[PDB]
């Protein structure tokens, strides 16, 4: 396999003389602005430089990226907007897009990113404010905030949660249901339930997404090292610590690149550099090479065929998958992404496996089907972002049609989770068996058409948690923890709890919330048999500080 190369067809690549920059831009926005489930996929990426009267509109499956080193390489004087026109001020299904490493200087002295889930925003530069919420206050379930600094107030209005990390905020106007925080400077004080703010000091360990850049007139990815106790931004004081991969060390993937010919790559020792596309897989992408980097572009999407596995990472050291929609195919796969194998007892300590900006959907674009999409059995791995998301709109949507029991199952040790979002399954969203976990910020939806209470007894319990400890665990701990639900086929059901876990003084929960949409089901408890129900019309959240 030859590495380096020409990134193809979907990467977009401007300079300030490039003619037209907002017509080009415009024209790739008209085309994914209500793309929801299409397949095109576009990279907008920008070398260092000024860039005047620009205003970047955002949709679906379009990343957005400045090429310096650090984010105030590359300026616009002028807005990255995501707004929910098209969704007539609706921002609940404004997903799967990104922007980093870019400063903004944005025209009224506001930035406006209202996005919902699958959206990130990191290593940005706002010199100005930033507006989370689209244009009118209408609904909003975001988000995801890192490595940036916003000089002036961050506003959420009525985005309904949020997570940010390892940041630098002016301001932040206020909160919904869950505004969760580690490691931000000037975020606001610990204040649950009341505005609804959980405030760490310090993330435990992050280690931030690797991105391409320009050294000269050479592209190389930068390769973050990782932080210990966290806060505030990485390139704040000008050097970052990492390490810069020429882009010949990498594969650079074009549909059409089978899974034979990805797998030859990574045992020849080259990186993966995903282009905007989607990748039809017949057997698993299988890394099984310590320090290997996996970086999508543009919402570059993996579909198993066959029922087979999409991604396989071995038991080592120090990968870096970023950036990848996995979607399900139509055949169940008995597992869609797989992080170290079943089992597994080795320690990643100093040098974790990570996955960022994950995105697995089962349904929604096709009928697609998986038991378990995403377990992880290396012990001390990092997943910072994950949405793992069973459809609830679109093709191929059904009780049985996308049927999707697990979401996340968490077995290794020393796991970390910061922004874990996790939606719909059958059964429970996430499990957790391993030892010393912790959650930093968790949103779940539970599956709105369960047909019946009998379609999700669980033994002696009405319904799956979304979010379960083993009752063999002596030790885990999450914070800043939401569930909520909307049983449209059958408003009658009864979900026990948001939250399972046994009790232990090791095993401590801190604000966990549960909420119904309108008295479409309610919960009987928050945990366990723990907390209120909730009760109602009016989506009122019921609260639990500490657990237990």
């Known amino acids: 396999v030859v590495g380096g190369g020409d990134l193809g067809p979907n990467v977009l690549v401007f300079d300030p003389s490039t003619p037209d920059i907002q017509?080009?831009?415009?024209?790739?926005?008209?085309?994914?602005?209500?793309?929801?489930?299409?397949?095109?996929?576009?990279?907008?990426?920008?070398?260092?430089?000024?860039?005047?009267?620009?205003?970047?509109?955002?949709?679906?499956?379009?990343?957005?990226?400045?090429?310096?080193?650090?984010?105030?390489?590359?300026?616009?004087?002028?807005?990255?907007?995501?707004?929910?026109?098209?969704?007539?001020?609706?921002?609940?299904?404004?997903?799967?897009?990104?922007?980093?490493?870019?400063?903004?200087?944005?025209?009224?002295?506001?930035?406006?990113?209202?996005?919902?889930?699958?959206?990130?925003?990191?290593?940005?530069?706002?010199?100005?404010?930033?507006?989370?919420?689209?244009?009118?206050?209408?609904?909003?379930?975001?988000?995801?905030?890192?490595?940036?600094?916003?000089?002036?107030?961050?506003?959420?209005?009525?985005?309904?949660?949020?997570?940010?990390?390892?940041?630098?905020?002016?301001?932040?106007?206020?909160?919904?249901?869950?505004?969760?925080?580690?490691?931000?400077?000037?975020?606001?004080?610990?204040?649950?339930?009341?505005?609804?703010?959980?405030?760490?000091?310090?993330?435990?360990?992050?280690?931030?997404?690797?991105?391409?850049?320009?050294?000269?007139?050479?592209?190389?990815?930068f390769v973050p090292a990782k932080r210990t106790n966290a806060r505030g931004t990485s390139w704040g004081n000008g050097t970052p610590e990492g390490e810069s991969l020429p882009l010949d060390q990498f594969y650079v993937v074009k549909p059409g690149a089978t899974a034979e010919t990805i797998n030859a790559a990574v045992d020849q020792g080259l990186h993966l550099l995903f282009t905007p596309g989607v990748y039809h897989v017949d057997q698993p992408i299988e890394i099984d090479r310590a320090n290997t980097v996996a970086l999508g572009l543009g919402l570059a999407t993996i579909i198993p065929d066959n029922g087979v596995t999409a991604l396989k990472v071995g038991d080592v050291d120090g990968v870096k998958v970023a950036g990848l929609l996995v979607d399900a195919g139509p055949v169940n796969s008995e597992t869609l992404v797989e992080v170290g194998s079943d089992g597994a007892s080795g320690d990643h300590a100093a040098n974790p496996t990570s996955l960022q900006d994950v995105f697995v959907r089962i349904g929604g674009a096709g009928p697609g089907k998986a038991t378990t999409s995403i377990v992880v059995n290396s012990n001390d791995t990092i997943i910072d972002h994950t949405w793992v998301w069973r459809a609830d709109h679109g093709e191929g949507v059904g009780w049985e049609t996308n049927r999707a029991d697990y979401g996340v199952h968490v077995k290794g040790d020393n796991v970390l989770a910061t922004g874990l979002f996790v939606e719909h399954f059958n059964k429970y969203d996430v499990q957790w068996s391993g030892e010393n976990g912790k959650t930093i910020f968790y949103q779940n939806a539970k599956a709105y058409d369960a047909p019946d209470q009998a379609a999700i007894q669980n033994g002696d319990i009405k319904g799956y948690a979304a979010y379960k400890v083993d009752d063999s665990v002596t030790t885990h701990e999450g914070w800043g923890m939401g569930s909520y639900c909307y049983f449209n086929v059958n408003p009658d059901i009864r979900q026990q709890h948001g939250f399972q876990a046994p009790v232990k003084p090791g095993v401590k929960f801190h604000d966990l919330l549960v909420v119904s949409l309108g008295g479409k089901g309610q919960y009987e408890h928050v945990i366990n048999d723990i907390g209120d129900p909730t009760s109602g019309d009016t989506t009122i959240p019921s609260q639990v500080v500490s657990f237990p």
């Open 23 to 221: 017509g080009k831009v415009d024209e790739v926005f008209r085309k994914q602005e209500s793309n929801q489930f299409g397949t095109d996929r576009y990279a907008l990426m920008f070398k260092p430089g000024t860039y005047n009267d620009i205003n970047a509109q955002i949709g679906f499956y379009t990343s957005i990226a400045g090429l310096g080193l650090n984010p105030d390489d590359t300026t616009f004087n002028g807005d990255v907007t995501v707004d929910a026109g098209w969704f007539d001020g609706n921002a609940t299904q404004n997903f799967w897009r990104s922007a980093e490493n870019l400063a903004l200087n944005p025209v009224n002295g506001t930035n406006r990113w209202a996005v919902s889930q699958a959206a990130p925003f990191r290593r940005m530069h706002v010199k100005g404010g930033l507006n989370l919420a689209p244009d009118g206050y209408g609904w909003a379930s975001g988000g995801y905030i890192a490595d940036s600094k916003i000089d002036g107030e961050v506003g959420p209005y009525s985005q309904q949660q949020w997570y940010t990390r390892d940041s630098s905020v002016g301001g932040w106007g206020n909160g919904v249901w869950n505004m969760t925080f580690s490691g931000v400077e000037g975020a606001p004080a610990q204040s649950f339930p009341e505005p609804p703010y959980t405030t760490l000091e310090t993330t435990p360990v992050s280690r931030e997404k690797p991105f391409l850049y320009l050294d000269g007139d050479d592209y190389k990815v």
